[PDB]
Paper text:
Biogenesis involves the de novo synthesis of a Fe/S cluster on the scaffold protein [name], trafficking of the cluster via transient association to various targeting factors, and finally cluster insertion into specific recipient apoproteins. A critical initial step in Fe/S cluster synthesis is the supply of sulfur by the [name] [name]. Here, we report crystal and solution structures of human [name] in association with [name]-[name], [name], FDX2, and FXN, together forming the ‘core ISC complex’. We show that eukaryote-specific [name] binds to [name] distal from the desulfurase active site and does not directly participate in catalysis.
Crystals obtained from purifications in the presence of ethylenediaminetetraacetic acid (EDTA) (termed (NIAU)2) did not contain divalent ions and diffracted to 3.15 Å, while those from purifications without EDTA contained a Zn ion bound between [name] and [name] ((NIAU-Zn)2) and diffracted to 3.3 Å. The catalytic site for Fe/S cluster synthesis is best defined by the (NIAU-Zn)2 crystal structure showing a zinc bound to the persulfide-carrier Cys381 of the swung-out [name] Cys-loop and to putative ligands for de novo [2Fe–2S] cluster synthesis on the [name] scaffold protein. The Zn site shows ~ 71% (chain D) and ~57% (chain H) occupancy in the two independent [name] molecules. Importantly, the presence of Zn causes a reorientation of the Ala-loop of [name], with Cys44 approaching and facing the Zn ion, whereas Cys113 as part of helix α4 maintains its location most distant to the Zn ion. Interestingly, both the electron-donating [2Fe–2S] cluster of CtFdx2 and the iron-binding helix α1 of CtYfh1 were located close to the Fe/S cluster biosynthetic center delineated by the Zn ion present in the (NIAU-Zn)2 complex. We conclude that both the [name] Cys-loop and the [name] Ala-loop undergo substantial structural adaptation in response to [name]-[name] docking.
Residue numbers in the entry:
A (entry chain C): 4 to 74
B (entry chain B): 5 to 85
C (entry chain D): 6 to 133
D (entry chain A): 54 to 452
E (entry chain E): 54 to 454
F (entry chain F): 3 to 85
G (entry chain H): 10 to 133
H (entry chain G): 3 to 72
Write the structure that this text describes.
């Protein structure tokens, strides 16, 4: 369903419990900017979308990603 | 800048992942990753501009070679399953 | 999927037939272990004969190329329920024809033949 | 299931690096001029690309561009070095020195020279595959003109002590030639630091195109070489014939890329090599590595799997392109002379296969090859009479 | 970054036929296996491509595939023929016969053999450029080992009577070799009809890839050749070294295509050649064609413009890629030995240029080249003192140094 | 039952694709040879030989497509007579 | 191939011929031995010994053509004695001629001196 | 220099400009075959920088039809 959380952990190698909806990739999950790029690309491959750079720029939290991956 | 740099990274990854060949594809992706990460902490703006320009040339090469591989593709590898 | 590698040889390799070993102590089994010269291809062939001179089963183990293994397996299939004298009529050329072996791999057939003859010699030698 | 198998045979040839092909195509499409046409623009641009590539090669090996001569491959280069040097000085020197593990082009060139009245010494190697320097010094004669020793062996990957051989040859006024086909772009090479006088380079060993190579002929002390290909005098008169522009362009691109990526390639190639070896050794006993691992290029791993014939194993791994030095695999049935020279028991000489790890090999490829290798080696051992006898012990078995 | 000039120099090299590049690319991308790797699929597919290409060449020249040896180019081929045949029979035969217009690789190979104690006769040519068969017959000696005569001249395009030479050599039990680099794929060649024993083939002369060639070594009445490149015995032991798969594949594609399009190419190339010559001659007097038009390949047209120096004209035609047999523009200031052989007056030897019409040449290129040729020959003639003197009828009596 | 229509599209395609060649020599040669070839075989009546020519023309159509694409990837300046 | 050579190529100055019958015209017709580069250079001298104009025609490579054009341009308005100081090395320096083409400069100098010699020979 | 397709057509079919009446038919009136017509419609696509698709192009057999389409 919204198992993007799984993906996030796979991308960041963090326990499924540590992908809190209110979590920030950099502030909380220890990712750099590159990790974030590879993350949004992994979501592009998993959900068959093309969230443009101007749209990707706003994806900084898990709940934001879940939200976007609904439309 | 910085955002321009990241845009470059994304572009080179997206284009690289279209390689038809397993060896070319995997190699391109891994080398791009290791390269940007290896240069992550460089501070000299001139060397940075140099590396960026080199990355642009390598991006054009990646585009052209990916297209060539698409025009002349063949069977996948046994390990692709 | 190959070149000068015949399909029959591939069948006798990927699907080795009569692979195994018997008890050399049964006095009713003749075991011949002969190896090839130039290409260290070694063949171990055991045959088991009940009374009346008929081969009741055959087993082998071979250290060698695919053509040698397949040649030996084919040997065991051929050395099935034939006369100990019948086996004397097995010719290397019949094997090479059956498998379409090129000249470079004939060392296999000549070895397989040898193995058969080595086994028969031990059996007759087992009758004091 | 018509899938293609993994390539683990980088020592026989390597794919084009997409950078090299991209470097080549313009000269296969638009810039088709002959580089020796001096009277129009097409020729001028061809010559320009050719000379630029030359600077690329020289830059990789630390030579002067005037010291790079383009040829059709490492074979032609080795022929030019051995036969050319030998012939030029024939009037006063007729002894040559090489080793028993050199490539067949060096060996057969020396053979033809033997048919021409030269005397040739084929140095033996230690079981490690490394020549003994004392036997080299003691082997040189007053009329010795040329010493030939390859840098890295193509069958076992051992690295020879190039620098010390250079010192010895230099101190004796003897020309030093090295077949560097297996080292260029994989391990560091500097012609001057190593006191090298001639060196052979093959394009398709370093992710470049097939059908092109180079020979380094020193100009500093100067080396005299008799040209073997007669013609119009192209390439300072050493190698007549029209220089294949696209091929030399690709060779230069390959050399530049190799100079860029040599360190990275060596790091990950070495890590993967250690992975393969350690993982195979822990799961299969009585597997022996041919060649001293203390002075060895990780890209070439030659292993003998006791009690198993090579070609049967190769056929077992129908999903991996490999090679073996087993007699039962050569047109003229012949076991690898390299393995015989390093003193490997003949039986294990028939049980050797060669894994090559290259710029594009993936860890998945390594693990797959390891797993299938274990599985089929076990299966074949249960089929092997030598296995059975070893578990029970015994000696001869007639011929 | 200005516009590019027309290519009219097809005798030096030719562009790749896009079909040939398409034939090559799969082996430059995915099929990179070594054809001598016998233990895996990459080798199997590479070998398959190589052998297919071999059959293609044999089909183009009417030989058996087993008689085709792959080389790095026509230069290596001629080296193998001349040096191999010469050396093999050295113990009993040391005389060779060739001609003075042969390519420089044949001539220089023969020169090295002279330095090795061989006897070589360089047959002269008639003013037409064609050898005299009688001098060939009378020149043959009992210890003659090899006769070498090129099929089509690379500078003037004259065709030698190959078939009759084959008959003569056969009747004298002498090996016959032909440098066919400029003829393969342009005129019909059959080794058996022509009694040919060895033949040289260049890949980049027939719109194939650079760096690859072939040598036909007859196997029927077997021909013996001593191998010059030592190694592992590839190619029946005649040419050790790794067969360059993509290059030979491209070579075969080129030979097959040439077999398909030979007649058509001859038709239109002939039309363009006649157009160029006839249109230039009707507008410029004292222009002389070098080589007999009765036995001439139309794709190579060598013309001398009296009273005008060649390189000056080439510089005039900065928009057309051409060549000339002029002393000037040559590294060692040296006039074309071919033109000297046909007896060309020194002036016309310095006044000759070579036009090449090829598979891809357009009529527009021909017309443009013709117009610029007329214009600039006129301009240079208004600048030429020899023209002025001829128009005045002076007497050749310049002063030198 | 005539394959005429199948031929015509092919002709159209083979011309259109050929007209995209960036290089003057390849473009002109391809177009002219396509025209002269179709015209030369216009009077063929044997359906099997016709199908043969059609299949060969299809292989050459794929070749022309790939080579035109590559020529676009590595284009250069036009010839002096192009302008 | 230097740019100066191209400029004198076809942009040549003073192409033509003068009247060989004039006692005030010196005509030098020199040919080279090595090749076929021929130069004809004619000069016209005023009563004060100044060259008032000169014309040339040369059959030879571009570098010879340019060498002769530069030659006549240089002898523009100089003294018959002044012109003798024109040196072939000055010509090659002016044109940046490579070593393979120096025969052109040597021919131009030779032509100049032969023409001046003809003039002096006509005054007698 | 307006709807001068006539020029194009005349160039393709080599007929005098006077015989290019709007009511003219390529095959019946101007002596063209089907191939010539293909090269012609392509010539119009190239001259006017359009792509008259196949489904529409199939019906272009008259000069007035060509004018009409554009
Ligand atoms: C890189 C360079 C590429 C090389 C180009 C080579 C291209 C190869 C193509 C050659 C293949 C052929 O000839 S294609 C062979 C087709 N030939 C025939 O079908 C014979 C009789 N057919 C007809 O007349 C038709 O119906 C028709 C003419 C349409 C009536 O047109 P209009 O309605 O009347
Ligand atoms: P963000 O979280 O702040 O990330 C940090 C970044 C890198 C974005 C930026 O802030 C930063 O730290 N910059 C310092 C250094 C830098 O920006 N380097 C960028 C250029 S690195 C480079 O040269 C890439 C290497 C390209 C080679 C790839 C070759 C692939 C193989 C080709 C196959 C055909
Ligand atoms: C592969 C190889 C060669 C072959 O050279 P070519 O370029 O194929 O002619 C020669 N020597 C060594 C050591 C090689 O590994
Ligand atoms: C062009 C040419 C050659 C050149 O052969 P390559 O090895 O391909 O450069 C040889 N002979 C003749 C007659 C030629 O015209
Ligand atoms: Zn075997
Ligand atoms: Zn000159």
């Amino acid at each position: 369903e919204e198992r993007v959380k799984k993906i996030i952990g796979e991308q960041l190698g963090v326990k499924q419990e540590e992908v809190t909806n209110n979590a920030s990739f950099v502030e909380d999950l220890g990712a750099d900017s590159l990790d974030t790029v590879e993350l949004v690309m992994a979501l592009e491959e998993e959900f068959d979308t093309e969230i443009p750079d101007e749209e990707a720029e706003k994806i900084t939290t898990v709940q934001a990603a879940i939200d976007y991956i609904n439309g | 800048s910085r955002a321009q740099v990241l845009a470059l990274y994304r572009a080179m990854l997206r284009e690289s992942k279209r390689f038809s060949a397993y060896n070319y594809r995997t190699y391109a992706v891994r080398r791009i990753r290791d390269a940007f990460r290896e240069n992550k902490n460089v501070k000299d703006p001139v060397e940075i501009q140099t590396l960026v320009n080199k990355a642009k040339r390598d991006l054009g090469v990646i585009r052209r070679q990916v297209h060539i591989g698409q025009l002349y593709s063949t069977d996948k590898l046994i390990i692709e399953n | 999927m190959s070149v000068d590698l015949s399909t029959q040889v591939v069948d006798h390799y990927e699907n080795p037939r009569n692979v195994g070993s018997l008890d050399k102590t049964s006095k009713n089994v003749g075991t011949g272990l002969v190896g090839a010269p130039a290409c260290g291809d070694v063949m171990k062939l055991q045959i088991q004969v009940d009374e009346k001179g008929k081969i009741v089963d055959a087993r082998f183990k071979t250290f060698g190329c695919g053509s040698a293994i397949a040649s030996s397996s084919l040997a065991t299939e051929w050395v099935k329920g034939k006369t100990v004298e019948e086996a004397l009529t097995i010719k290397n050329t019949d094997i090479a024809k059956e498998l379409c072996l090129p000249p470079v791999k004939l060392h296999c057939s000549i070895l397989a033949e040898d193995a058969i003859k080595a086994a028969l010699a031990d059996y007759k030698l087992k009758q004091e | 299931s018509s899938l293609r198998p993994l390539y683990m045979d980088v020592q026989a040839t390597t794919p084009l690096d997409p950078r090299v092909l991209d470097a080549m195509l313009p000269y296969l499409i638009n810039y088709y001029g002959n580089p020796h046409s001096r009277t129009h623009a097409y020729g001028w641009e061809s010559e320009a690309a050719m000379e630029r590539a030359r600077q690329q090669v020289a830059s990789l090996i630390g030579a002067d561009p005037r010291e790079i001569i383009f040829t059709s491959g490492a074979t032609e280069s080795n022929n030019i070095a051995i036969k050319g040097v030998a012939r030029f000085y024939r009037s006063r020197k007729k002894h040559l020195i090489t080793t028993q593990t050199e490539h067949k082009c060096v060996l057969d060139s020396c053979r033809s020279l033997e048919a021409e009245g030269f005397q040739v010494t084929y140095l033996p190697v230690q079981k490690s595959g490394i020549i003994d320097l004392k036997e080299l010094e003691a082997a040189i004669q007053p009329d010795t003109s040329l010493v030939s020793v390859m840098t890295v062996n193509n069958e076992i990957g051992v690295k020879q002590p190039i620098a010390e051989i250079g010192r010895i040859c230099s101190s004796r006024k003897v020309y030093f030639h090295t077949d560097a086909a297996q080292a260029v772009g994989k391990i560091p090479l500097d012609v001057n630091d190593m006191k090298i006088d001639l060196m052979s380079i093959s394009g398709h060993k370093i992710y470049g195109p097939k059908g092109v190579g180079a020979i380094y002929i020193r100009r500093r002390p100067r080396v005299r070489v008799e040209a073997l290909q007669s013609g119009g005098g192209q390439e300072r008169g050493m190698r007549s014939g029209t220089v294949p522009t696209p091929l030399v362009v690709g060779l230069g691109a390959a050399c530049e890329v190799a100079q860029q990526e040599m360190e990275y390639d060596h790091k990950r190639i070495s890590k993967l090599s250690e992975r393969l070896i350690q993982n195979i050794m822990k799961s299969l006993p009585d597997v022996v590595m041919n060649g001293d691992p203390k002075h060895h290029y990780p890209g070439c791993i030659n292993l003998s799997f006791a009690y198993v014939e090579g070609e049967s194993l190769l056929m077992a791994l129908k999903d991996v392109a490999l090679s073996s030095g087993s007699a039962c695999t050569s047109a003229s049935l012949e076991p690898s002379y390299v393995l015989r020279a390093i003193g490997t028991d003949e039986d294990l000489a028939h049980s050797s296969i060669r894994f090559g790890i290259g710029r594009f090999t993936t860890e998945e490829e390594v693990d797959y090859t390891v797993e299938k290798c274990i599985q089929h080696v076990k299966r074949l051992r249960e089929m092997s009479p030598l296995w059975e006898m070893v578990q029970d012990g015994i000696d001869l078995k007639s011929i």
